[PDB]
Design a protein around this nucleic acid. Structure first.
Ligand code: ZN
Lengths: 77, 58, 34, 112, 27
RNA sequence: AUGCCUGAAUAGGGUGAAGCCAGAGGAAACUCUGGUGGAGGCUCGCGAAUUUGGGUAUAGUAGCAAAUAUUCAAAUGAGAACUUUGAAGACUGAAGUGGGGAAAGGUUCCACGUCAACAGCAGUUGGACGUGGGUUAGUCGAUCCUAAGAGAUGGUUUCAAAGGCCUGACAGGCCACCAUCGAAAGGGAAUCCGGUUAAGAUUCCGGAACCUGGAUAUGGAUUCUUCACGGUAACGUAACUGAAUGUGGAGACGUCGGCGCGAGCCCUGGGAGGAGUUAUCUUUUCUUCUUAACAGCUUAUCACCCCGGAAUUGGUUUAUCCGGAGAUGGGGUCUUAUGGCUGGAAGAG
RNA sequence: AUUCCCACUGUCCCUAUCUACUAUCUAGCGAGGCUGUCUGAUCAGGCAUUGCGUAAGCAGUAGAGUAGCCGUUACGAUCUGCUGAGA
RNA sequence: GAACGCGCGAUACUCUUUGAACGCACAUUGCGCCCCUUGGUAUUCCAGGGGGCAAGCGU
């Protein structure tokens, strides 16, 4: 499995011809400041690997979710 | 705490090791008093050099 | 007392052997120098 | 306090099969066979480990690039730096001595 | 276990060390 | 009797050899004292002996087949001391009466029905009988390689015509040296976790990943047009052509000792759960709190490089070894073994 | 290896008792205290091939000592009384 | 002659694996090479089928 920090790379991954499904996973976890927050993992598998994008920002995750292709199947959790 | 190697050796090899040690001690004790058991260096020392041998022959 | 004696003469034999081999090493290196 | 054993056909304590104990995500202790460690490549003149060259198994070298198993200097990947420097100096001095010997010879049969 | 099956005759007469059969002499 | 090849084992307690350090006596040699160090025909539990696997050479009498401890209730059944469930008592005590393998055995594994024979009493039980079911691999082994040795060819490469390759709008040229067998413990490309059956698992299912071989396409580089740069150096890189020929590394290699580091286990504090005991005391006793292969970033003792030139000799190990053949000191390069964070991954357990 | 001295002993005078095991028949077949350890601690018990005479509990202002102040919390072995008791 | 199967051999109440036994090995259902042909995207890959492999310094 691979991790990617690039949002547009993830979007390019989800835009290819051989894309099956994308998984959106939510984790309720605390940061070093002690205040808990919501972390979102976007997972899509390419040719031979599973690429994961981890976002600790809620607004960015919402924008990325709204920017996903409308013909792409998305697994919630 | 006993080590694994100690347990394995004591379970496997202790008896024959002790028996061979006993046999070696018995043989050494038996041949301690016998006459005719010498090391090669001791035999050479008793033999002496060549010049010592012409000295003895004279 | 006899054991301590035989020990010190053993020390004497060992020191003499070491000194002799050191002198022989120096002598044989001297030839290789020139 | 959970006891583990070999996971393969060999039941003997040979150098080929060696066991480590790891706790799996299932919460149990399990055995894992460890491969033989790799050996650093050695210089062909003095036998010291080569610097800047990756340490891999013999067949793992065919799957990496040339920059991971070579040095940009001459003899890089075969001999270390001091050996190459000694080779250069020795070759130059040998050639110079050859020139000097040839000049001396040309002088000595120039008499007749 | 000094003997094993012989291919030519099917008996337990093939000496493993000698690689010869004591019943039909193979080969 | 003596061997050879490839593996396993060569442990523990005690004592305390050289060498070294600090002291005292002596002009040296040396000798004592304390420490350190961790060696042996040292000890402890012509002759004999000298661990081990695979391969390979030269009268219903004697008696009960001997391995201790059984008891209560219920179920099944024609029939229960022997079958099953629960309760009690006891045992093995990790060097097991516990879980696996090589060899060997060959269905003895699991289910259903049965007691004619067998399991030296009995039996409704079974390693018995009858009928069925069951063994899933690119990654684990064999298959490949050679070891001692064996063994074709004409005794193991020998007075053998013993074979492949290359060049060129059939001739020429290059090279030497012998088949094959022999290891499921030696060398060797690559898979992990979770779940799943009456009986199958690194083989099946789910997820995740690597190895080898092959044909090909795209991007990038190959910077004036033609095989790239940087640093004094160690060396660094997203690449960055390379025939014959000649070499080097890994494979690839005795044994022992202490020291340093990582991991698994053991020990332990707080807290979040569950269980036991409580006439009295006991913030108490037990148990859960786990993170695989693989992948990205980062992380080194040693070694090496540059500056510099050291006696008032310094540095330094548990172990007195190192320095003008360049120390102390200052600044750098490298191997990624192994830790850390993250993805796998909490969705699992 | 042998001989003398002292001490001990069922070797003996001189045997006796207990435990385990064995032997026999039947159904079938058939030639109070102590050491170590464990029940969380007391109490009460298990094991270690008998392992080798004052109860439990409570009280005292007496009590080695642990723990509060410069007349005084608390814990407390041991001792005393209920107790020739308890079994 | 042997092994495995339904007197017989996958055409089994034509002729499997062998055996003097023949491509090489062999205590293995192990390892090759050559010619034709067929299929799966196919000039390269993979697989199936058929048939095979015990010159001279002489005149
Ligand atoms: Zn070198």
């Amino acid at each position: 499995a691979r991790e990617i920090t690039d949002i547009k790379q993830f979007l390019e991954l989800t835009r290819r011809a051989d894309v099956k499904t994308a998984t959106v996973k939510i984790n309720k976890k605390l940061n070093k400041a002690g205040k808990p927050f919501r972390q979102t993992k976007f997972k899509v598998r390419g040719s031979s690997s599973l690429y994961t994008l981890v976002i600790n920002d809620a607004g960015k995750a919402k924008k990325l979710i709204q920017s996903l292709p409308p013909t792409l199947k998305v697994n919630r959790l | 705490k006993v080590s694994k190697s100690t347990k394995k050796f004591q379970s496997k090899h202790l008896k024959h090791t002790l028996d061979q040690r006993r046999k070696e001690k018995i043989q050494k004790k038996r041949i301690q008093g016998r006459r005719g058991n010498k090391t090669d260096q001791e035999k050479a020392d008793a033999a002496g050099t060549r010049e010592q041998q012409q000295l003895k022959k004279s | 007392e006899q054991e301590r004696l035989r020990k010190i003469e053993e020390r004497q034999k060992i020191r003499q052997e070491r000194k002799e081999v050191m002198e022989e090493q120096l002598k044989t290196f001297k030839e290789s120098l020139n | 306090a959970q006891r583990v054993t070999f996971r393969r056909r060999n039941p003997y304590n040979t150098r080929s099969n060696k066991i480590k104990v790891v706790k799996t995500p299932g919460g149990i202790l399990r055995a894992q066979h460890v491969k033989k460690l790799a050996t650093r490549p050695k210089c062909g003149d003095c036998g010291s480990a080569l610097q800047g060259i990756s340490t891999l198994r013999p067949r793992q070298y065919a799957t990496v690039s040339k920059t991971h198993k070579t040095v940009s200097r001459a003899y890089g990947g075969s001999r270390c730096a001091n050996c190459v420097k000694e080779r250069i100096i020795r070759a130059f001095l040998i050639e110079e001595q050859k020139i000097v010997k040839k000049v001396v010879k040309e002088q000595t049969e120039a008499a007749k | 276990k000094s003997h094993t099956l012989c291919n030519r005759c099917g008996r337990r007469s093939f000496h493993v060390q000698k690689k010869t059969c004591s019943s039909c002499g193979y080969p």
